[PDB]
Amino acid sequence: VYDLSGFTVKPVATVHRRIPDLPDCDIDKWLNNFNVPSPLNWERKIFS
Amino acid sequence: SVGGLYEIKIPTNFTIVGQEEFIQTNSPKVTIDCSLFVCSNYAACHDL
Numbered sequence: 001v002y003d004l005s006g007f008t009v010k011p012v013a014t015v016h017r018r019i020p021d022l023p024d025c026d027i028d029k030w031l032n033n034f035n036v037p038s039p040l041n042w043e044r045k046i047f048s
Numbered sequence: 049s050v051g052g053l054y055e056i057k058i059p060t061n062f063t064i065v066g067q068e069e070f071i072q073t074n075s076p077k078v079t080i081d082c083s084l085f086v087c088s089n090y091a092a093c094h095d096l
């Protein structure tokens with residue numbers, strides 16, 4: 001009697017859930033701003 | 049011994065007492081799929 005390697009029931013579908021209607025982060029607009037700071041006064045922006 | 053006779057307590061009445069004793073002769077037959085235990089179904093883990 002041979003106990004074979006364990007199998008797992010393969011998925012039949014995929015569930016993808018995200019919050020809808022969120023705005024674009026516009027990260028490139030902030031990174032491409034022409035007023036570039038020096039390392040001494042580095043600027044920060046938070047995207048959420 | 050007094051006059052070659054010793055004092056001894058001899059029973060005059062009795063009963064039958066029962067004492068149970070469990071002796072383990074078996075145990076649960078644990079089987080482990082080492083592949084499924086170590087790596088659930090992750091191909092990257094089964095490769096390593």
Ligand SMILES: *[C@@H]1O[C@H](CO)[C@@H](O)[C@H](O)[C@H]1NC(C)=O
Nearest residue numbers: 058059060061062063064065
């Ligand atoms: C023995 O002990 C039992 C229980 O106490 C009693 O019923 C019985 O009469 C006794 N017999 C004698 C001969 O002492």
